[PDB]
Amino acid sequence: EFNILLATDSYKVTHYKQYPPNTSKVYSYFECREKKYEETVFYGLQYILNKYLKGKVVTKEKIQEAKDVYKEHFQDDVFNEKGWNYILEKYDGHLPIEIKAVPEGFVIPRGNVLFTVENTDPECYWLTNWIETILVQSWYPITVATNFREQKKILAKYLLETSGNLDGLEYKLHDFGYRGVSSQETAGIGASAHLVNFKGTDTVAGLALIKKYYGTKDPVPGYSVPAAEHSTITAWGKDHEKDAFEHIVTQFSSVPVSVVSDSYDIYNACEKIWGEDLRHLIVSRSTQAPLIIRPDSGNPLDTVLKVLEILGKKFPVTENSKGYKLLPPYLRVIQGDGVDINTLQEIVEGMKQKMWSIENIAFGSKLTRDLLNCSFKCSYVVTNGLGINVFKDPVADPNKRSKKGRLSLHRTPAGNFVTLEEGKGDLEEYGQDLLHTVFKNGKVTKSYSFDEIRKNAQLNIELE
Amino acid sequence: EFNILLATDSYKVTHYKQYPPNTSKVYSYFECREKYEETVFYGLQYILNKYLKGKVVTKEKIQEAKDVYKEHFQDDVFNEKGWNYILEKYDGHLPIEIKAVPEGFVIPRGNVLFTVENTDPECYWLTNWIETILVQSWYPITVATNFREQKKILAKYLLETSGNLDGLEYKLHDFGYRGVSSQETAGIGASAHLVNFKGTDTVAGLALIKKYYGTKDPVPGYSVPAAEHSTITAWGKDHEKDAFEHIVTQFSSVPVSVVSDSYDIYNACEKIWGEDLRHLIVSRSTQAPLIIRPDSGNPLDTVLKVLEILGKKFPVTENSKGYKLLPPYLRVIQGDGVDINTLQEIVEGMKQKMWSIENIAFGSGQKLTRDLLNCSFKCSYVVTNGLGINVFKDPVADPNKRSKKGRLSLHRTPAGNFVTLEEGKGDLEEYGQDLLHTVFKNGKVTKSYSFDEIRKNAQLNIELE
Ligand SMILES: O=C(NCc1ccc(S(=O)(=O)c2cc(F)cc(F)c2)cc1)c1ccc2nccn2c1
Numbered sequence: 001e002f003n004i005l006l007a008t009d010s011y012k013v014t015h016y017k018q019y020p021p022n023t024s025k026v027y028s029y030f031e032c033r034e035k036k037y038e039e040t041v042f043y044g045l046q047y048i049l050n051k052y053l054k055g056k057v058v059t060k061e062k063i064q065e066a067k068d069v070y071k072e073h074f075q076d077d078v079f080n081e082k083g084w085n086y087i088l089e090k091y092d093g094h095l096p097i098e099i100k101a102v103p104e105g106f107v108i109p110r111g112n113v114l115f116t117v118e119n120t121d122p123e124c125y126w127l128t129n130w131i132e133t134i135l136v137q138s139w140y141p142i143t144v145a146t147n148f149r150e151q152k153k154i155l156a157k158y159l160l161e162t163s164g165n166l167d168g169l170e171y172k173l174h175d176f177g178y179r180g181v182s183s184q185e186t187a188g189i190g191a192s193a194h195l196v197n198f199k200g201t202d203t204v205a206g207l208a209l210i211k212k213y214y215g216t217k218d219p220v221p222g223y224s225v226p227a228a229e230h231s232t233i234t235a236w237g238k239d240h241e242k243d244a245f246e247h248i249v250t251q252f253s254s255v256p257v258s259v260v261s262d263s264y265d266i267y268n269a270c271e272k273i274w275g276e277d278l279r280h281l282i283v284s285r286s287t288q289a290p291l292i293i294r295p296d297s298g299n300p301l302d303t304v305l306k307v308l309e310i311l312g313k314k315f316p317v318t319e320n321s322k323g324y325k326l327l328p329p330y331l332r333v334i335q336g337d338g339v340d341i342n343t344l345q346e347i348v349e350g351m352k353q354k355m356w357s358i359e360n361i362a363f364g365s366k367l368t369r370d371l372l373n374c375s376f377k378c379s380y381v382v383t384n385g386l387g388i389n390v391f392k393d394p395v396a397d398p399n400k401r402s403k404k405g406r407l408s409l410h411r412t413p414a415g416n417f418v419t420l421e422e423g424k425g426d427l428e429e430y431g432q433d434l435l436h437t438v439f440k441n442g443k444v445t446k447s448y449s450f451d452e453i454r455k456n457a458q459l460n461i462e463l464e
Numbered sequence: 465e466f467n468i469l470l471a472t473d474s475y476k477v478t479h480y481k482q483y484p485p486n487t488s489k490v491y492s493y494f495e496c497r498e499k500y501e502e503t504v505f506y507g508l509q510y511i512l513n514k515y516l517k518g519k520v521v522t523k524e525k526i527q528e529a530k531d532v533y534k535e536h537f538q539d540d541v542f543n544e545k546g547w548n549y550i551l552e553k554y555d556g557h558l559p560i561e562i563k564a565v566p567e568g569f570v571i572p573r574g575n576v577l578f579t580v581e582n583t584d585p586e587c588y589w590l591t592n593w594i595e596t597i598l599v600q601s602w603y604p605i606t607v608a609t610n611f612r613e614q615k616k617i618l619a620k621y622l623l624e625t626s627g628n629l630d631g632l633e634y635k636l637h638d639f640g641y642r643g644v645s646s647q648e649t650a651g652i653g654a655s656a657h658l659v660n661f662k663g664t665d666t667v668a669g670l671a672l673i674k675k676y677y678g679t680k681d682p683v684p685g686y687s688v689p690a691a692e693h694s695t696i697t698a699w700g701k702d703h704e705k706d707a708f709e710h711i712v713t714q715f716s717s718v719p720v721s722v723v724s725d726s727y728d729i730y731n732a733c734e735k736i737w738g739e740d741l742r743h744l745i746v747s748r749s750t751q752a753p754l755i756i757r758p759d760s761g762n763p764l765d766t767v768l769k770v771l772e773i774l775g776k777k778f779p780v781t782e783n784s785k786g787y788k789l790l791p792p793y794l795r796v797i798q799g800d801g802v803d804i805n806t807l808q809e810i811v812e813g814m815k816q817k818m819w820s821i822e823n824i825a826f827g828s829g830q831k832l833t834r835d836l837l838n839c840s841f842k843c844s845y846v847v848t849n850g851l852g853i854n855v856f857k858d859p860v861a862d863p864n865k866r867s868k869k870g871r872l873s874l875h876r877t878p879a880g881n882f883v884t885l886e887e888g889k890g891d892l893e894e895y896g897q898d899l900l901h902t903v904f905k906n907g908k909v910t911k912s913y914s915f916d917e918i919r920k921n922a923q924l925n926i927e928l929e
């Protein structure tokens with residue numbers, strides 16, 4: 001079972017002894033520090049609060065466990081047993097902490113306060129930064145949500161240009177990343193952040209996370225359809241790729257189905273197998289049950305263009321109202337090899353240059369904490385009853401300078417966001433603080449449904 | 465609770481309908497595909513124990529999956545019968561056999577590392593159902609490998625500048641807890657780092673190792689007290705010296721690291737440590753050094769400038785190799801921007817400036833991906849209508865993605881290297897014993913390794929010498 005006393009950087013175990021004597025408050029904040037990616041989607045704190053921070057997170061057994069582990073880990077007695085026992089005894093193991101945050105799904109420019117943390121009991125001055133490590137992992141859902149939103153902007157631009165509308169945009173970037181992430185827990189979190197932006201996923205772990213921690217009106221937040229993998233083709237033997245294809249499309253004759261076609265020769269598969277031998281099985285399919293051909297190797301742009309060129313000569317192509325070529329409704333393509341934000345752009349731009357509609361294609365999808373510079377810093381403390389504004393400001397890197405004092409987030413006269421420092425929010429010159437109390441003394445005090453998060457994270461173009 | 469029926473890529477739910485009819489066996493393998501020439505095999509045992517072993521199928525889990533997939537696919541495609549069979553016939557234990565190279569083994573790219581096959585003909589579909597969960601072993605493999613390569617660099621330069629490898633296992637400390645994607649990842653990643661080193665701040669790694677692997681020592685990893693920017697800055701911008709003095713006095717008898725770049729790293733080293741507080745430093749024991757931590761600026765330039773500063777404020781000696789060495793009560797740690805490329809740049813830069821690597825330690829925490837070592841799971845053999853056939857992919861535009869054929873086995877070559885035999889050629893017995901061992905069979909873990917054996921297996925040659 002998870003033990004919050006063992007869920008911090010080791011050195012933080014020793015910090016309670018290092019603050020100035022008589023420190024009663026430590027107040028810290030999280031921002032995506034300013035230096036592409038000018039605005040970030042704030043998403044994922046709610047998961048952390050509920051799974052790890054709320055309720056009785058301290059017990060006698062957990063304190064004894066940490067005591068024993070840290071004795072061996074430090075080869076010495078340094079663990080703050082008394083501090084944790086106090087929280088156990090005084091607050092029945094609930095954390096005397098208050099956290100204020102921007103609403104989940106909000107799109108905010110870099111360099112703004114996203115959330116703040118402070119102790120609500122003077123005895124627990126040391127607790128604010130103990131939980132830095134766990135709260136900072138919010139960088140991941142934030143960065144995933146942000147990066148996927150940036151990809152969606154690109155797809156929307158090109159789909160709108162080549163087709164005149166945004167029909168199907170939310171199914172244009174399917175999550176294929178389950179096997180490529182570092183753990184089961186990460187798969188769930190990352191998939192949930194993808195699903196803020198899209199509705200097609202193969203990462204099943206995302207559905208349960210969303211249902212447990214966020215909630216949707218619909219039974220599930222994400223969908224998929226049947227498809228082959230290389231093993232269901234290659235198992236038939238090298239000479240029987242056609243038999244494989246025929247069997248699979250016949251098994252899934254009235255639902256969409258995607259079939260990886262590059263096991264031996266993508267160009268032959270498209271031109272001769274799909275385009276000639278099995279063509280009669282494809283042109284007979286319903287608009288609701290297209291075959292989606294999947295190339296999966298070679299240069300992604302070159303291969304997509306060649307595949308379209310091949311299919312365009314074997315199948316009846318139309319020209320839509322914007323003048324772009326469109327495959328018949330029972331035939332589409334999906335490319336999931338090598339697709340990052342850069343190549344996605346390259347492919348849609350290249351399709352556009354060859355007069356191919358983005359209607360024809362869908363895509364299948366490492367980010368670090370450094371990408372958006374997600375950082376947690378102490379900005380205000382109270383020692384001997386006097387408040388002081390604190391910050392780092394390293395001489396050799398002005399970009400690492402942190403914010404000073406009590407912080408608040410505000411709407412500007414032009415309707416933008418601004419972060420006020422040094423408690424200046426209290427001057428009431430910028431109206432109300434936009435942060436909301438989301439956690440206080442062991443309880444989640446404000447939360448958001450996945451439907452509302454999705455709404456908050458919409459593109460302007462979707463808002464029309 | 466975790467549900468194996470919900471722990472696969474969605475499309476794999478539909479594959480049981482796609483294999484050739486009359487298929488009784490699907491046999492698949494994992495390799496770090498050739499295109500980091502040797503990889504540390506580590507982490508499978510965790511997955512086996514946490515997710516695959518025991519009664520992993522129940523009536524409730526089958527129903528939960530049926531319900532989820534009905535909505536997810538908007539269709540009934542889930543193989544309820546197949547899972548029911550496992551529940552009824554095997555008390556919910558997976559009829560799968562997994563054979564793997566021992567954990568810790570250091571194996572060249574392009575070799576079979578583990579194989580998976582169904583042990584019951586009805587469960588031909590199950591082999592690849594669990595590809596997704598097993599392929600996540602790419603992560604501890606790649607972390608263990610990447611840290612081993614950083615250890616090789618440190619070893620080379622420590623040996624060259626000092627004449628020995630003393631303290632090598634504490635030269636790269638794990639700082640990465642906050643920078644990973646999740647709590648679970650933190651434990652897995654820390655455990656892979658600990659295959660190579662002993663200093664860690666990622667506590668999660670210790671519990672994982674104790675639960676899934678085990679060590680003779682009480683814990684596999686260690687740390688010492690240290691400040692963070694907050695415990696310095698909280699004193700106020702005018703009181704950095706007061707913060708330093710308080711902290712080193714609180715930890716007067718144990719090693720302590722103190723981040724010194726809050727305002728001006730060069731002033732802090734030359735004037736605060738080097739003059740105002742020097743008397744509190746030179747009095748420290750060799751078992752309790754102060755470890756100064758810069759944390760900004762160009763990593764190489766900042767490290768050299770910090771050493772140059774300290775070298776003029778403190779008594780430097782020259783070791784038998786001709787390199788400069790700070791007095792034993794004073795050391796440096798660089799934990800900002802340290803990846804494998806910059807680690808190399810720093811130690812080489814230090815060597816050029818005649819500074820021993822004894823003076824410095826590093827902290828870790830671009831990302832490693834599954835593409836780095838090309839970790840991949842592929843079907844190589846099936847039995848259909850009672851006939852074994854060797855299967856594989858071989859995409860025309862990318863020979864690098866060609867996969868291996870048939871039943872596989874891993875062997876020592878006559879010169880002591882490794883070779884993977886394809887097409888069941890291992891059966892000829894021309895290359896001695898298959899090095900893959902059965903680690904999982906029919907819901908039971910059949911062979912396990914302690915963390916101690918793994919560390920021994922993953923040792924560097926320079927350590928062996
Ligand atoms: O094919 C796979 N999954 C199935 C799939 C099929 C089509 C589409 S689509 O976007 O064309 C589509 C989406 C949808 F929800 C409704 C549709 F009608 C059309 C998306 C997803 C697949 C492939 C490689 C892979 N690697 C790891 C996991 N992986 C899964």
Ligand SMILES: O=C(NCc1ccc(S(=O)(=O)c2cc(F)cc(F)c2)cc1)c1ccc2nccn2c1
Nearest residue numbers: 009011637639663665686687690719721755797825
């Ligand atoms: O200072 C930190 N942890 C403490 C620390 C102190 C010294 C050494 S050392 O390698 O000098 C050392 C190791 C050891 F085990 C025995 C020693 F005597 C000497 C390593 C680690 C720290 C700093 C930044 C950070 N970000 C996230 C987590 N973080 C932790």
